[PDB]
Swiss-Prot record, chain C:
Post-translational modification remark: 4'-phosphopantetheine is transferred from CoA to a specific serine of the Acyl carrier domain by the C-terminal PPT domain. This modification is essential for activity because fatty acids are bound in thioester linkage to the sulfhydryl of the prosthetic group.
Note: Present with 17000 molecules/cell in log phase SD medium.
Function, as annotated: Fatty acid synthetase catalyzes the formation of long-chain fatty acids from acetyl-CoA, malonyl-CoA and NADPH. The alpha subunit contains domains for: acyl carrier protein, 3-oxoacyl-[acyl-carrier-protein] reductase, and 3-oxoacyl-[acyl-carrier-protein] synthase. This subunit coordinates the binding of the six beta subunits to the enzyme complex.
Protein name, entry field: Fatty acid synthase subunit alpha
Highest taxon, organism lineage: Eukaryota
Record's subunit section: [Alpha(6)beta(6)] hexamers of two multifunctional subunits (alpha and beta).
UniProt record similarity statement: Belongs to the thiolase-like superfamily. Fungal fatty acid synthetase subunit alpha family.
Gene that produces this protein: FAS2
């Protein structure tokens, strides 16, 4: 009753960064509230999402909770790298989250975000996402 | 939208109806030159989007601080600390988003004497006083009523 | 034998009845003459 | 104490923005704009 599915995932994602996995790696916690995602708005969704993440999130039961889950992973990766800016504004289309159905989510990063990552000393970038009706939390680690 | 009750004035007639429900339309008009921005829904929504960013920030800083309290706990029984205490930060994040919605969405007019209870009730859905279509009169077939 | 004292009149006249109901900021003031708390028409829909 | 700091900040930014809306008003009748609209920011600061 009290400890629902969302509290198991959020408790497990900040039990994987309590000084065990985070030995030699820059970490990135980002939450985004579901309400602040506007799905009908096509300026925000085209410029900050790939055609692979729009095809996935649109087909889910909770389309607004799934866009807020992905959007949190892109702001968790972007902090975990250490880098402050990727030239002008925030175009986080470049940082792609390939979420396979019943499978741990993968980060494959292209464009100017790939360059400043391999320059900083970053081989692999993990990420975890829990999303529900309110909050969408995202933890990322970036090791050499 | 609204549901009120009023008495009337000093009398000596218990069946005599009065005007006391007029108070659902009580508002101040001394200072009615420029439109109050509390009635504009765009404004009200801008203030909520701002306050939602602040709550997003607030949740990060309590998950940073919950990581720095989980370390001192022996790692055998820190699972049950995190389950208990992420659920507590879920709640406090929900309360604050509701309280902000209550302030800009639902109760924007409760402490503004330039907005009548009747007008505010209808303004919470972008309706004007000019949309109250039909009035269902008590209409008892008495002279006084 | 006066703890209880029925009011004979409201704090407003039947002329101000509606103007008072409609102003949320209308308050009552000692009336110089009668010495009793009434609504004065100056304090109804008043800038101050 | 945290949330009171945020409201303090919030009032500054609505008094900056009320200065940048008072300029476009002719300076003859911008007194009655400021009286109306600082009172509205007093309320919204109190509510919060």
């Amino acid at each position: 009753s009290y400890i629902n599915a969302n509290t198991i995932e959020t408790a497990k994602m900040i039990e994987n960064m309590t000084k065990e996995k985070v030995s030699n790696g820059g970490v990135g916690v980002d939450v985004e509230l579901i309400t602040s995602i506007n799905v009908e708005n096509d300026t925000f969704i085209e410029r900050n999402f790939t055609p692979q993440e729009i095809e996935y999130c649109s087909a889910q039961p909770s389309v607004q909770s799934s866009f807020a889950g992905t959007w949190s992973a892109k702001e968790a990766v972007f902090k975990s790298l250490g880098v402050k800016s990727l030239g002008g504004g925030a175009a986080l289309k470049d940082i792609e989250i390939v979420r396979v159905n019943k499978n741990a989510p993968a980060v494959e990063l292209h464009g100017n975000a790939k360059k400043a990552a391999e320059e900083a000393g970053v081989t692999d970038v993990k990420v975890s996402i829990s999303h529900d009706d309110l909050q969408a939390v995202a933890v990322a680690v970036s090791t050499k | 939208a609204m549901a009120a009750t009023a008495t009337d004035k000093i009398g000596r007639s218990v069946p005599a109806p009065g005007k006391g429900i007029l108070t659902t339309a009580r508002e101040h008009h001394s200072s009615v030159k420029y439109a109050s921005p509390n009635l504009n829904m765009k404004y009200r929504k801008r203030q909520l989007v701002t306050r939602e960013a602040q709550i997003k920030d607030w949740v990060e800083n309590e998950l940073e601080a919950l990581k720095l309290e989980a370390e001192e706990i022996p790692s055998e029984d820190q699972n049950e600390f995190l389950l208990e205490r992420t659920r507590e930060i879920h709640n406090e994040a929900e309360s604050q988003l509701r309280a902000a919605q209550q302030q800009w969405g639902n109760d924007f007019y409760k402490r503004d004497p330039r907005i009548a209870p009747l007008r505010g009730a209808l303004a919470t859905y972008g309706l004007t006083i000019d949309d109250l279509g039909v009035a269902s009169f008590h209409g008892t077939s008495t002279k006084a009523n | 034998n006066k703890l209880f004292v029925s009011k004979e009149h409201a704090p407003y006249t039947d002329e101000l009845e509606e103007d008072v109901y409609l102003d949320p900021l209308a308050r009552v003031s000692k009336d110089k003459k009668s010495g009793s708390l009434t609504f004065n028409s100056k304090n109804i829909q008043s800038k101050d």
